[PDB]
Design an enzyme around this catalytic site. Structure first.
Site, mmCIF file in Angstrom:
data_model
loop_
_atom_site.group_PDB
_atom_site.id
_atom_site.type_symbol
_atom_site.label_atom_id
_atom_site.label_comp_id
_atom_site.label_asym_id
_atom_site.label_seq_id
_atom_site.Cartn_x
_atom_site.Cartn_y
_atom_site.Cartn_z
ATOM 1 N N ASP B 58 0.840 -1.188 0.000
ATOM 2 C CA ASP B 58 0.000 0.000 0.000
ATOM 3 C C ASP B 58 0.879 1.243 0.000
ATOM 4 O O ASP B 58 1.830 1.338 0.781
ATOM 5 C CB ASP B 58 -0.927 -0.007 1.216
ATOM 6 C CG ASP B 58 -2.024 1.041 1.132
ATOM 7 O OD1 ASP B 58 -1.705 2.242 1.019
ATOM 8 O OD2 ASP B 58 -3.214 0.663 1.182
ATOM 9 N N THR B 91 -3.171 6.115 -3.581
ATOM 10 C CA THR B 91 -2.000 6.780 -3.017
ATOM 11 C C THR B 91 -0.752 6.522 -3.855
ATOM 12 O O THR B 91 0.012 7.451 -4.148
ATOM 13 C CB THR B 91 -1.789 6.320 -1.578
ATOM 14 O OG1 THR B 91 -1.907 4.894 -1.513
ATOM 15 C CG2 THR B 91 -2.829 6.947 -0.670
ATOM 16 N N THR B 92 -0.511 5.263 -4.223
ATOM 17 C CA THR B 92 0.616 4.951 -5.095
ATOM 18 C C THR B 92 0.517 5.698 -6.418
ATOM 19 O O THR B 92 1.486 6.318 -6.867
ATOM 20 C CB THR B 92 0.695 3.446 -5.339
ATOM 21 O OG1 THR B 92 1.027 2.778 -4.119
ATOM 22 C CG2 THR B 92 1.755 3.137 -6.372
ATOM 23 N N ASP B 392 -9.137 -0.873 1.984
ATOM 24 C CA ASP B 392 -9.121 -0.447 0.587
ATOM 25 C C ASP B 392 -10.369 -0.923 -0.148
ATOM 26 O O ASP B 392 -11.019 -0.151 -0.860
ATOM 27 C CB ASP B 392 -7.860 -0.967 -0.107
ATOM 28 C CG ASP B 392 -6.644 -0.090 0.148
ATOM 29 O OD1 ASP B 392 -6.764 0.897 0.901
ATOM 30 O OD2 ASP B 392 -5.565 -0.388 -0.406
#
Ligand code: ADP
Ligand code: ADP
Ligand code: ADP
Ligand code: MG
Ligand code: MG
Ligand code: MG
Ligand code: MG
Lengths: 523, 529, 529, 106
Positions: B58, B91-92, B392
């Site tokens: 994550d 986020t990535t 998630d």
């Protein structure tokens, strides 16, 4: 060792001290010189708390930097003063003070006395004030478009310039709602009653000013309603718990039934408080102190929604918004103290937190500006810019006079001072004309930060301002060209520019009066 | 310099230095996080200073756990934290798009182009890209199959494939259970309990509740079939008077009377509970379970055991609502007038001991509007990983439900938005066309990294994909097993419209502000001392 | 996020203690500030009212002077731009001998005005162009500002009137005496050929009485004693030997190889008889004074005393050469008696005691010779060194007048006329060069401003009066230091004059130094070893 | 720029080698073969000295250098630059730099 003063007491004096003060001041100026105008660039400051401050605001920068020279300390203090007084011009003032001290350094090297320079500076300040008041124009504050243009002309130099219309509407609505009059005393307190809540995430384009207030709170008990369409609200400063007495109320039990009787008396006290509240038939109860679980039980039985521990400031804003009056003894509760005026109480989940909205109010004299954006830093900068915008709106609503921007006002005043100096025959005409030419630094800085030719443009501008009806001519901070401010639209508040000039000139006067530094001595 | 003449121990990065510093840190973060992207990404291990192990893919977790002390890295971590708090995913991709925007802008700024002009191009391209996103979004009736595809697209990136196929059904059923028509989804009503005894594929959805505690009286039953649930918030332990009291007696007999009397207040509440129990269960056919948010002393526990009641103490303020939504009773703060309508029903209640811990299952409710996800796994780090993954997935399904639209995945929307931006570029006035081109080449980092992580040539794969999308116009992305273009909407690879919009907005904003940074400066106290 | 890292590239590759400055702010303005500080350190010594300074160098030696070049040498200037300005001042001292403080003042002023112009918005290239064009105009103008000329350098009253100005700035109270002395010396050593050597003026500083007991001596003085018994000679027949006054020996190791008692008995008697023969041949040539550059042997001294020869030993070879030049002799490398031409003559050679000091005087009676000495008396060694510096200034002025006999008015008159004419030229020059030309003109005002400031009057009133008089037409008017109030008078009629060549070179060198300081844009200092 | 996109440095260097070959060919094609007259040599020396020093000093040093080379040069015989002494004197202006048609011993 037979000393007269303690070791560590070092005393400097003379032209070295004067030049040192002036260099420290103009260094403080050079720090933020590039943060002026619409084409300025951001600076990333590193807080002592591992934080970050990404800003263009002169006062933010000078507030985050640390110095040891007392002249630099004084310059930082005058930047703070300007920010607290008008909330804009925090770097224009710094730059003007730096330039005034710089031009006074000349006369100081040439054997002129600092008191002579100072008297000349004060004459020039009075004449600056006169000229600004002469070239100013009035404003019809009822013209929402005029006010929106003023606010755009004030926030265009900041990061929110991309969302200029949004931020202008937010600031105008907030200030017009916070405008309040009581007993013949108008008061725009945009610090206690215009609140900015930054919720990271979302998009800035959904930021808004609420017709009400917002707090980070949930119902005390999940059986309480979270949606009420015409809530009657009660505000309290007192705990709905059973707390001890102020005296040594120690009890003494010898009978069996007395312990249980005492606990039941506590329960009955809570019941009686809750009944004193229910008698007003409210829908919501909001407390600054705790609410016991038995009190929650009784309120829920009465179908009342309660919010447990709100801040005193938030409670005052809820009062101003929903039309309630904070109480401290539910026995002393009256219908006039109950809050009617809120159009909706909602408690919705923003992210993983519960926020209480008291919005849809009618005639709310308080507001909450809900800012949404990419991160805490972006939202801190947006909040600072909105503070600037609201302070400008307030300054306008107080003093409806406007002056032209883009350095047009600076050039007009410089020209007027040069024209007035020709009647002066003493020795002060030279420092007087010097501060006159020291006002040119604002358009000079604008040209420098846009990336145009300072020499050529400032010459063309000084020439334009020698004609008759050209005191409105200035420069674009976006293209590097001369324009008429009547055509561009960059108009500053007369109050802002007056405070700028006054603070700059007085800071120069102070640092010129200063000599003979002493140090070391311990309080 | 200027700041260093006033504060000699001051650190300063000016104009070009500042930009180099910021872009270098951003590219460093991108270099670390490139491998997280996609199901073919690699799991990183993170070891605390104490020695605790974290296995994560994550982006936000990786950011916060990495050992970094850089200002730009802090800025980007904060942007990612906001993205995660509001949307739960992205986020990535957020970090990657920021890094690639900064790189593509440095490409033109090194050649003397101004970052202000690059940011103008960035804003224009952001606007057009948001428009194209709104155009390509697929407004769909959110059925279980669509939600399953969405949750699969998230869980297959976050965890192993079999565990993802399990968590998919678990998460989708959980959300489809706690969801009321036209009523924002309260994810608080999905408890998430972790048990550390069995395999990770035993993670299940209990159509009820699982409390991390059990009965504290040994003689209390460990299994109850037809249970009346009493959710209360009433202290059943000894309560002292608010005002200081004290007992005064002249004889041991009086002391005994006072000892018996001091408990009458709580005995009365116990008697009320026992009378309700007797009134609703005239025999031993049904069961009765008290669940108290507050304490219960041994005397009350004994008194309830004698009558056959299972009493749990010190439950959670959220379990109050979760129990009132699962079982269906009323949570009480007083036993003033308690009635059988205040009770809920659970078709089964039992206890499970695991080493030193106890669990209480409340199942077979009628139509529970609150459920729990039981995260089973052999390791603390496995449990943490599954917790992150189900967070998630829950956020993904909730967002797909809220926004009835859903966006194709596998970099398809990124490819298409790049093409649209490049076709729109000429309509931009001046050298902001270069900022637009940079925005497009930045958007193209998602398919590029997907290919790079599946083990393919970035340029060749991207050329294939762009060619297929230009000839046909279909939204195509990377097939992570063949490197060929594939239609994400047909193969079931879906992304969240909200997530993509948040990406565009926040990435553009932070990249613009970083590009416009021209001086990094540490000139404060440098410590609060 | 509490530390700014060094930017990638040169900032990281830089060595440990090295510094790198770039741009107007970090390099140009700091250089201008340093040069301004230097000019301020030396400003208060400019002119007749200039005050002395007592500089103590790293060797704890004390210098009390108002000579700019001396002050600069004895200061440890460490800023490189200031070092360059000092190099310019020392080049002025070497080329002309006077005007170093002018060079300093003018360079500092040019740099201050260059900073001003850079702030108003000119580029270093344009500033340098304008400075060069204005220096060319000043050099074109100065010949027209030339007012008087020397017209005779063989007189003693005119030469004194000419040297008085240069030796007035230093030693203002007593300058007519010193001008008399230096004129006497210079015209003594001035040959029929137009070439004048400043090394032929020797200065002997003896600690006694006062500066008014100083005198000129047509000859040489050595703080020595005589080696023998003779102390005075009235018709000197000096014979000069660069070799010792001993028997010549072999450059290869010599050994006295004795093999017989007869050789042993006769060796020493033969050696002394040889020495006696040598010294008697020397005496029989008529020589009554012998001056040896090496050592003296006891036997040779014995025989010199026997034959009534005054022996003098001059350790230094420059001293020996100057004695030969003085007396008209030739240094013989062998102890062979001199021929009639190799011998030197002096009207008297005697041993005297000036104060505590013993001296040997080679004194001519004629008012001429190849070398002349100035015997400086004084109550302090530092005072005598200051008077020696003033003497050097006067002698270098005499040489400058032998080179170029043209003179310009002093006391700021030439500077004011230069400022006026260059301002009038810049008012005609269009383009951005006019600003720099006008600033170059205004820089000249720094000279009369410094003169006035040290005189103790208002420099602004002084400069306004000077401008008014030079506008009405008097180019020979400068400021009057003999006035408690701002005043002005005819520098020519007063006799206050400077050297055209001095001013020419001072302006040229100051302009070159300023322009070089401006041409610097980046500085890369190394770690101070 | 291309290696960050996964291109191999070996392939980039192969392209570098090809481009080097073609560039050397094009250079040989575009070179201007000219009779080396004093004017051409003056233009060359100016092109270098104007980059290395101030413009007036470059206008002096150009003639100085060209005359020196045209003096120590023998037809079809490699130029021995050792036969051009370079002596520095530290007394006058920089534009006094001259060519002595002889020698200057220190
Ligand atoms: N678009 C523009 N073009 C030219 N000048 C502008 C423009 N916008 C603002 N200004 C001028 O810039 C000056 C300073 O702007 P700002 O940065 O907001 O204040 P400060 O410099 O005090 O922070 C104002 O006096 C205003 O007249
Ligand atoms: N099975 C798949 N095939 C192709 N692409 C996929 C697949 N699953 C996910 N993706 C893509 O990989 C990208 C990154 O996924 P993920 O790592 O879950 O998001 P983030 O990178 O924000 O954590 C998503 O944009 C998605 O479109
Ligand atoms: N009697 C005088 N009255 C006015 N000015 C004088 C007088 N004597 C000398 N000066 C001025 O003083 C200057 C010489 O100062 P000085 O300290 O010698 O500078 P420098 O050593 O650099 O030449 C000259 O420019 C001259 O004009
Ligand atoms: Mg402002
Ligand atoms: Mg994801
Ligand atoms: Mg002198
Ligand atoms: Mg070259």
């Amino acid at each position: 060792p037979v000393l007269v003063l303690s070791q560590n007491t070092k005393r400097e004096s003379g032209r070295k001290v004067q030049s040192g003060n002036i260099n420290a001041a103009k260094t403080i100026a050079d720090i933020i010189r590039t943060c002026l105008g619409p084409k300025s660039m951001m600076k990333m400051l590193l807080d002592p708390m591992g934080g970050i401050v990404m800003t263009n605001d002169g006062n933010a920068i000078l507030r985050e930097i640390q110095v040891q020279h007392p002249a630099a300390k004084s310059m930082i203090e005058i930047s703070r003063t300007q920010d607290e007084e008008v909330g804009d011009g925090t770097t224009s003032v710094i730059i003007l003070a730096g330039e005034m001290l710089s031009v006074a350094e000349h006369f100081l090297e040439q054997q002129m006395h600092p008191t002579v320079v100072i008297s000349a500076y004060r004459k020039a300040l009075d004449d600056m004030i006169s000229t600004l008041k002469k070239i100013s124009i009035p404003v019809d504050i009822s013209d929402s478009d005029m006010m929106l243009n003023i606010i755009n002309s004030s926030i265009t130099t900041k990061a929110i310039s991309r969302w200029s219309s949004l931020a202008c509407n937010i600031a105008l609505d907030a200030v017009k709602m916070v405008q309040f009059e009581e007993n013949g005393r108008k008061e725009i307190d945009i610090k206690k009653y215009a609140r900015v809540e930054k919720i990271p995430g979302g998009i800035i384009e959904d930021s808004c000013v609420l017709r009400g207030v917002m707090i980070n709170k949930d119902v005390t008990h999940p059986r309480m309603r979270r949606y009420i369409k015409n809530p009657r609200i009660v505000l309290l400063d007192s705990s709905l718990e059973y707390k001890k007495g102020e005296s040594q109320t120690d009890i003494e039990i010898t009978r069996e039934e007395d312990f249980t009787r005492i606990l039941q008396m506590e329960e009955e006290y809570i019941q009686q408080l809750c009944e004193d509240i229910i008698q007003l038939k409210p829908d919501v109860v909001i407390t600054e102190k705790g609410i016991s679980d038995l009190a929650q039980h009784y309120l829920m039985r009465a179908n009342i929604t309660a919010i447990r521990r709100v801040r005193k400031t938030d409670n005052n804003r809820i009062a101003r918004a929903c039309g309630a009056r904070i109480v401290s003894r539910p026995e002393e509760l009256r219908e006039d103290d109950v809050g009617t005026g809120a159009g909706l109480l909602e408690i919705k989940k923003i992210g993983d937190e519960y926020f209480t909205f008291i919005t849809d109010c009618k005639d709310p004299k308080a507001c909450t500006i809900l800012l949404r954006g990419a991160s805490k830093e972006i939202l801190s900068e947006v909040e600072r810019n909105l503070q600037d915008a609201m302070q400008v709106c307030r300054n306008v609503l107080l003093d409806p006079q406007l002056v032209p921007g883009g350095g047009a006002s600076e050039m007009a005043v410089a020209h007027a001072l040069t024209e007035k100096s020709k009647a002066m025959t003493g020795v002060e005409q030279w420092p007087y004309r010097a501060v006159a030419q020291a006002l040119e630094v604002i358009p000079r800085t604008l040209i420098q930060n846009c990336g145009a030719s300072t020499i050529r443009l400032l010459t063309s501008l000084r020439a334009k301002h020698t004609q008759e009806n050209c005191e409105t001519w200035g420069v674009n901070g976006e293209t590097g060209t001369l324009v008429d401010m009547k055509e561009l639209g960059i108009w500053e508040p007369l109050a802002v520019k007056l405070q700028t000039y006054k603070t700059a000139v007085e800071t120069a006067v102070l640092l010129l009066r200063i000599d003979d530094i002493v140090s070391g001595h311990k309080k | 310099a200027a700041v260093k003449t006033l504060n000699p121990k001051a650190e300063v990065a000016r104009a070009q230095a500042a930009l180099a510093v910021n872009i270098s840190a951003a590219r460093g973060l991108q270099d670390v996080l490139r491998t997280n992207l996609g199901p073919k990404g690699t799991m990183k291990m993170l070891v605390s200073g104490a020695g605790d192990i974290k296995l994560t893919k994550d982006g936000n977790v990786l950011l916060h756990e990495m050992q970094i002390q850089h200002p730009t890295a802090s800025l980007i971590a904060k942007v990612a934290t906001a993205q995660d708090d509001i949307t739960g995913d992205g986020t990535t991709s957020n970090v990657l798009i920021i890094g690639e925007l900064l790189k593509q802008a440095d490409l033109y700024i090194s050649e003397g182009l101004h970052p202000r002009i690059i940011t103008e191009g960035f804003e224009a391209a952001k606007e057009k890209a948001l428009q194209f996103l709104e155009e390509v979004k697929v407004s769909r009736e959110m059925d279980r199959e669509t939600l399953i595809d969405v949750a699969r697209t998230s869980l297959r990136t976050k965890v192993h494939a079999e565990l993802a196929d399990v968590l998919t059904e678990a998460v989708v059923d959980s959300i489809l259970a706690i969801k009321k028509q036209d009523e924002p989804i309260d994810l608080f009503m999905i408890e998430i309990m972790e048990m550390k005894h069995k395999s990770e594929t035993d993670t299940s959805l209990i159509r009820g509740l699982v409390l991390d505690h059990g009965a504290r009286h040994p003689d209390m039953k460990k299994r109850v079939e037809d249970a009346y649930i009493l959710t209360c918030n009433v202290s059943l332990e000894y309560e002292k008077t608010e005002v200081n009291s004290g007992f005064f007696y002249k004889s041991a007999e009086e002391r005994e009377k006072l000892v018996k009397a001091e408990r009458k207040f709580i005995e009365d509440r116990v008697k009320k509970i026992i009378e309700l129990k007797r009134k609703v269960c005239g025999d031993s056919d049904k069961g009765f379970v008290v669940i108290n948010q507050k304490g219960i002393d041994p005397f009350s526990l004994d008194a309830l055991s004698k009558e056959g009641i299972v009493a749990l103490r010190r439950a959670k303020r959220r379990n109050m609502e979760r129990l009132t939504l699962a079982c269906g009773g009323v949570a009480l703060n007083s036993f003033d007038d308690l009635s059988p309508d205040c009770l809920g029903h659970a078709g089964l209640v039992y206890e499970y001991t695991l080493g030193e811990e106890k669990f209480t299952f409340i199942e077979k409710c009628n139509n529970p509007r609150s459920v729990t996800l039981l995260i089973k796994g052999p390791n603390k780090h496995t449990l943490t990983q599954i917790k992150d993954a189900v967070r998630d997935g829950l956020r993904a399904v909730k967002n797909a439900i809220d926004d009835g639209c859903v966006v194709p995945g596998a970099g398809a929307v990124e490819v298409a938005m790049a093409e649209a931006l490049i076709k729109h570029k000429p309509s931009v006035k001046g050298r902001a066309q270069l900022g637009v081109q940079a925005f497009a080449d930045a958007l193209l980092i998602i398919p590029k990294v997907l290919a790079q992580n599946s083990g393919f040539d970035l340029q060749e794969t991207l050329v294939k994909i762009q060619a297929e999308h230009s000839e046909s116009g279909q939204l195509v992305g990377v097939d992570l097993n063949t490197g060929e273009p594939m239609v994400a909407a047909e193969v079931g690879v879906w992304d969240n419209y909200c997530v993509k919009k948040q990406l565009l907005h926040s990435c553009t904003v932070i990249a613009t502000n970083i590009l416009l940074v021209d001086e990094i400066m540490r000139a404060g106290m440098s410590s609060l001392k | 996020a509490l530390h700014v890292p060094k930017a990638p590239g040169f900032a990281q590759m830089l060595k440990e203690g090295a510094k790198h400055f770039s741009g107007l702010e970090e390099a140009v303005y700091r250089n201008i500030q340093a040069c301004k500080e230097l000019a301020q350190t030396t400003r208060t010594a400019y002119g007749p009212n200039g005050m002395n300074k007592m500089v103590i160098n790293h060797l704890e030696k004390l210098f009390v002077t108002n000579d700019a070049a001396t002050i600069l040498r004895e200061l440890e200037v460490q800023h490189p731009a200031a070092k360059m300005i000092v190099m310019a001042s020392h080049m002025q001292e070497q080329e002309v001998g006077d005007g170093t403080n002018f060079v300093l003042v003018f360079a500092g002023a040019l740099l201050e005005l260059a900073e001003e112009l850079l702030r108003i918005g000119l580029s270093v290239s344009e500033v340098i162009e304008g400075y060069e064009i204005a220096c060319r105009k000043a050099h074109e103008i100065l010949p027209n500002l030339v007012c008087c000329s020397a017209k005779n350098l063989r007189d003693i009253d005119e030469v004194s009137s000419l040297l008085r100005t240069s030796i007035m700035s230093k030693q203002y109270g007593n300058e007519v005496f010193l001008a008399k002395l230096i004129a006497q010396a210079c015209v003594s050593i001035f040959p029929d050929s137009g070439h004048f050597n400043v090394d032929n003026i020797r200065v002997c500083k003896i600690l006694g009485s006062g500066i008014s007991s100083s005198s000129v001596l047509h000859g040489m003085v050595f703080k020595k004693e005589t080696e023998g018994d003779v102390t005075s000679v009235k018709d000197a027949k000096i014979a000069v030997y660069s070799c010792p006054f001993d028997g010549m020996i072999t450059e290869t190791k010599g050994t006295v190889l004795i093999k017989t008692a007869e050789e042993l008995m006769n060796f020493s008697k033969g050696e002394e008889n040889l020495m006696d023969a040598q010294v008697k041949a020397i005496a029989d040539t008529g020589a009554n004074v012998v001056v040896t550059g090496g050592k003296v042997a006891d036997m040779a001294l014995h025989y010199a005393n026997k034959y009534n020869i005054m022996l003098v030993r001059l350790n230094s070879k420059w001293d020996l050469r100057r004695l030969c030049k003085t007396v008209g002799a030739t240094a013989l490398p062998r102890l062979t008696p001199p021929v009639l031409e190799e011998m030197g003559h002096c009207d008297s050679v005697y041993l005297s005691e000036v104060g505590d000091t013993q001296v040997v005087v080679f004194k001519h009676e004629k008012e001429d010779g190849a070398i002349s000495t100035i015997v400086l008396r004084g109550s302090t060694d530092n005072l005598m060194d200051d008077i020696e510096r003033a003497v050097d200034d006067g002698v270098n002025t005499f040489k400058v007048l032998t080179r170029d006999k043209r003179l310009v008015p002093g006391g700021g008159a030439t500077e004011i006329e230069l400022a006026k004419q260059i301002t009038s030229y810049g008012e005609t020059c269009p383009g951005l060069e006019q600003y720099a030309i006008k600033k170059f003109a205004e820089a000249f005002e720094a000279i009369p401003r410094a003169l006035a400031e040290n005189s103790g009057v208002k420099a602004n009133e002084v400069i306004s009066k000077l401008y008014a008089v030079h506008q009405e037409g008097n180019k020979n008017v400068g400021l009057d230091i003999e006035a408690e109030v701002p005043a002005v008078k005819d520098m020519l009629e007063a006799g206050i004059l400077d050297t055209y060549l001095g001013k020419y070179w001072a302006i040229k060198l100051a302009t070159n130094a300023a322009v070089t300081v401006l041409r610097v844009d980046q500085i890369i200092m190394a770690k101070p070893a």
